[PDB]
């Protein structure tokens, strides 16, 4: 057994981190490997993760974080049986991947505009609450060439598009992803889509 | 009823003051009375984050800055439209509130903006007249003030 590429991890900055790594040869991740992780701190407890196969020689491990702050630093130990293969560190605040928004709904209140609203994926108790800027993606079901990405740079999770920039009689679909500039995060996965057919 | 204004002076309305549990714990004199309406202090007589007693109060929760100035507008993209402004106090202490509407709107719609972010409209109707105005608040990383500043001078965009 040998480590091909080094384990890289991402965090949602709330509860779950995820780590991926490729192996030398094909391996049964659940049978051969164990991943120990623990928060470097006075009061902390060690945790063990069972890897899942993602491919032939690619293992993935879901990590459990009760609470994450920016200073938190975790020690990762990759074990094959009783012989260490790889050791490393992981600061979740430096590898954040936010949770996707949801509760995406279409409001036809105003006749001059079309209101889109979604739910901020984090509770107000989370540090990422007032740092999430979103990006709404709208596309036409009839004209695939109509594929727009609006950038929402204010704190509220809503979007008002001019009703004149939409065409009458065709149905559009929308989805929204989120990112936090303050923490230099990657993008969240696209939310599930909503559909509407305006006339 | 004291209020600090953009880290410049203070206005109290309806004496002597001293800094509680810190250096320079001598009672001073109101150099400039207000008509007796109240008192006023200079920028050197103001030490934020110091237990200010005259009636005791915290100073960083009583700051009211100036309204923003130099409001600009320019399209960041084919559909984007970014609004800029300038502030007198430290830009890393202010929480801005942007408010806009059209000439057909019967009510203002507003969105909040962080200090590190810049406001922008992702979608704009080119055949409508827009009007923007911004006010700021000294909150929440440098203080816990609940009062905003005055609305800046409005800016306009578009035709029809």
């Amino acid at each position: 057994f040998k480590v091909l590429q080094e384990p890289t991890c991402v965090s949602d900055y709330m509860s779950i981190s995820t780590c991926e790594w490729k192996m030398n040869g094909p391996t049964n991740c659940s049978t051969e490997l164990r991943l120990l992780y623990q928060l470097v701190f006075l009061l902390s407890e060690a945790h063990t993760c069972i890897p899942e196969n993602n491919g032939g020689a690619g293992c993935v491990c879901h990590l459990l974080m009760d609470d994450v702050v920016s200073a938190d630093n975790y020690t990762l130990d990759l074990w094959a049986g009783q012989q260490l293969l790889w050791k490393g560190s992981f600061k979740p605040s430096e590898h954040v991947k936010p949770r996707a928004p949801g509760n995406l709904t279409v409001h036809t209140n105003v006749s001059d505009t079309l209101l889109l609203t979604w739910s901020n994926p984090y509770p107000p108790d989370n540090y990422l609450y007032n740092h999430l800027t979103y990006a709404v993606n709208i596309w036409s079901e009839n004209d695939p060439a109509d594929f727009r990405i609006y950038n929402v740079t204010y704190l509220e999770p809503s979007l008002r598009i001019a009703a004149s920039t939409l065409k009458s009689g065709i149905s559009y679909r929308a989805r929204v992803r989120a990112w936090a500039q303050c923490y230099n995060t990657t993008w969240s996965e696209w939310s599930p889509s909503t559909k509407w057919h305006n006339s | 009823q004291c209020f600090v204004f953009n880290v410049e002076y203070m206005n109290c309305t309806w004496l002597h003051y001293w800094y509680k549990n810190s250096d320079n714990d001598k009672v001073q004199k109101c150099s400039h009375y207000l008509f007796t309406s109240g008192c006023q202090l200079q920028k050197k007589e103001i030490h934020l984050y110091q237990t200010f007693v005259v009636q005791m109060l915290k100073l960083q929760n009583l700051v009211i800055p100036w309204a923003p100035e130099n409001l600009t507008l320019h399209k960041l993209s084919e559909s984007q439209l970014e609004l800029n402004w300038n502030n007198r106090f430290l830009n890393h202490c202010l929480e801005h509130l942007v408010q806009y509407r059209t000439d057909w709107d019967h009510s203002w719609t507003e969105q909040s903006v962080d200090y590190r972010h810049k406001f922008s409209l992702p979608s704009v109707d080119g055949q409508k007249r827009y009007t923007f105005r911004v006010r700021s608040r000294f909150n929440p990383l440098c203080g816990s003030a609940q009062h905003w500043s005055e609305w800046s001078h409005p800016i306009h965009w578009g035709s029809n």
């Epitope: 036409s140 695939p144 060439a145 594929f147 727009r148 920039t165 009458s168 | 080119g126």
Partner: antibody, heavy 122, light 108 residues
Framework: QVQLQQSGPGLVKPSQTLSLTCAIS??????????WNWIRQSPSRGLEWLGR?????????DYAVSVRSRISISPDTSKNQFSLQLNSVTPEDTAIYYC????????????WGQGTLVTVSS | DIQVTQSPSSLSASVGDRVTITCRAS??????LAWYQQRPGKAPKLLIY???SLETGVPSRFSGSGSGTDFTLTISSLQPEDFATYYC?????????FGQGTKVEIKR
């Protein structure tokens, strides 16, 4: 910033095939927010739209009726290019040919190529 | 097929005048109309999209108005560099159809 470089002008014998290419800088041919078009201009035709190719979840092609029976527009994601081909050309196909980046959702040419004059003559 | 007819063929106006070019569509196309400028020897340049919105870097003296089938491009305070041919184009559906052009000549 986007920059579009076209192939050189030249001669094409009648009933042969016209082929032009467009080199894209500052954008991707496989961009899903844009569409890549070919337009020709001449007195007998005016400003005539030929067709477009664009990528969303797969490649799409759209042509004009006047040239659909003779036209083919193809992307080149290794050299970041796209090309136009017209076969069975007549002297009526003599014109100035532009490539252009049209915005996908509002169908408008943001960026155009300098233009290539193709002459059809024996 | 959305057809588009532009008028007039040509016009001469002095520096500072208010030039107006019109464009009539075959069907209702809401506000999906664009305006281009072609200076001599150069490719067309986008001026106005979505009937009324100025492309960045285009001087503020260019105006677009109209909705439905009748649209209008307006140049206030005509300038010597505004000498070109102006094309409209419906952006509603493919195939894109352009106007016949309008040669704006400067009168000095």
């Amino acid at each position: 910033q986007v920059q579009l470089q076209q192939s050189g002008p030249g001669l094409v014998k009648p009933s042969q095939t016209l082929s032009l290419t467009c080199a894209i800088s500052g954008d991707s041919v496989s961009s899903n927010i844009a569409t890549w078009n070919w337009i020709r201009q001449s007195p007998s035709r005016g400003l005539e739209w030929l067709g477009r190719t664009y990528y969303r979840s797969k490649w799409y092609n759209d042509y004009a009726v006047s040239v659909r029976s003779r036209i083919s527009i193809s992307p080149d994601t290794s050299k970041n290019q796209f090309s136009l081909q017209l076969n069975s050309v007549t002297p009526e196909d003599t014109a100035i040919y532009y490539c252009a980046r049209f915005s996908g959702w509002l169908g408008t040419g943001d960026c155009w190529g300098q233009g290539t004059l193709v002459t059809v003559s024996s | 097929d959305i057809q588009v007819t532009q008028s007039p063929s040509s016009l001469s106006a002095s520096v500072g005048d208010r030039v107006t070019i019109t464009c009539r569509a075959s069907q209702g196309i809401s506000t999906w109309l664009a305006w281009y400028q072609q200076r001599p020897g150069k490719a067309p340049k986008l001026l106005i999209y979505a009937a009324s919105s100025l492309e960045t870097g285009v001087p503020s003296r260019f105006s677009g108005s109209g909705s439905g089938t009748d649209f209008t491009l307006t140049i206030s305070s005509l300038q010597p560099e505004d000498f070109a041919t102006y094309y409209c184009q419906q952006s509603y559906s493919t195939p894109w159809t352009f106007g016949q052009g309008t040669k704006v000549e400067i009168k000095r």
